[PDB]
Design a protein around this ligand. Structure first.
Ligand SMILES: [Mg+2]
Ligand SMILES: [Mg+2]
Ligand SMILES: [Mg+2]
Ligand SMILES: [Mg+2]
Ligand SMILES: [Mg+2]
Ligand SMILES: [Mg+2]
Ligand SMILES: [Mg+2]
Ligand SMILES: [Mg+2]
Ligand SMILES: [Mg+2]
Ligand SMILES: [Mg+2]
Ligand SMILES: [Mg+2]
Ligand SMILES: [Mg+2]
Length: 231
RNA sequence: CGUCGUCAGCUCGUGCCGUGAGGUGUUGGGUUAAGUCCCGCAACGAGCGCAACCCCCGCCGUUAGUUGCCAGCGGUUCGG
């Protein structure tokens, strides 16, 4: 499922803005840029993909977490492929530790999923009506993938654990496996199942994400091949 | 009942921070008569307030035509 010629997308970056705790996954500092060693990645993917495949094999649920620009749309696709919950735009504080309370915003969502599912009564003030069509969109803008998350997840798969320290901190507090792909600017000790590598190259973000999702399909029966590897 | 003050404010529930008082939310950018609304955000909602629903005034319609009114023909002591 893995590769060895994945070294043709990323092998690391981020020039001397590093976290010293990451040095045990760094091979050399060449063009001003810290270069990640992938023999450290290959062993680690063996751990992570051992965890991911074994997790879906028993009915798990991985909350995929991506927020930044270079990983915005790709995390939407890959989580929808495996039918997995994603958080796309903003990570709402408490989403995990205050789950039974933010989930109270998807019930309001399903409400406007029924209301604007013709008709209940649309014959109630259009102002009072189009008031809601904006509240509808907003809920979809932030709860589009979290809605399928009906219960506190079994693990989370984040794109950037520094950029997403809030989500990590909550999951760590709930004894939730924190699995993540991370480059030279993050804390290995905070990640339960690590994937050392670039998290800014879309050419690399999609790679370790798209063919990680592929592994999730084969663990819940049957395979599919093509996912969006847009150029 | 007066008053501050019809001033835009005062708080709660869960989560987060803090040894603790307490903080966050309610701060920030913009907008409003307004914590009014928008965008942002370790917060997510909620309540009391603000607004609204209520009464008078301003235009039009329906429904009614005496004790009210008189547009147009008839009288008319000349007062519908
Ligand atoms: Mg970064
Ligand atoms: Mg005051
Ligand atoms: Mg509290
Ligand atoms: Mg202090
Ligand atoms: Mg505490
Ligand atoms: Mg408090
Ligand atoms: Mg206050
Ligand atoms: Mg406060
Ligand atoms: Mg205040
Ligand atoms: Mg303050
Ligand atoms: Mg006022
Ligand atoms: Mg706010």
């Amino acid at each position: 499922v893995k590769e060895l010629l994945e070294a043709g997308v990323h092998f690391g970056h981020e020039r001397k803005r590093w976290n010293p705790k990451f040095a045990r996954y760094i091979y050399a500092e060449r063009n001003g840029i810290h270069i990640i060693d992938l023999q450290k990645t290959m062993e680690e993917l063996e751990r992570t993909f051992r965890f991911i495949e074994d997790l879906a094999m028993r009915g798990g649920t991985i909350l995929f977490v991506g927020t930044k620009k270079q990983a915005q749309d790709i995390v939407r696709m890959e989580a929808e492929r495996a039918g997995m919950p994603y958080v796309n735009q903003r990570w709402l504080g408490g989403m995990l530790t205050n789950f039974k309370t933010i989930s109270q915003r998807v019930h309001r969502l399903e409400e406007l999923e029924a209301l604007f599912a013709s008709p209940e009564i649309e014959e109630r003030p259009k102002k009072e009506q189009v008031r809601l069509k904006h509240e509808l969109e907003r809920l979809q803008k932030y709860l589009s993938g979290f809605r399928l998350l009906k219960r506190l997840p079994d693990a989370i798969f984040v794109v950037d654990p520094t950029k997403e320290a809030i989500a990590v901190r909550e999951a760590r507090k709930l004894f939730i496996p924190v699995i993540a792909l991370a480059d030279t600017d993050s804390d290995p000790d905070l990640v339960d199942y690590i994937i050392p590598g670039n998290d800014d190259a879309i050419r690399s973000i999609q790679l370790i994400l798209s063919r990680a999702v592929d592994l999730i399909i084969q663990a819940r029966g049957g395979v599919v091949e093509p996912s969006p590897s847009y150029a």
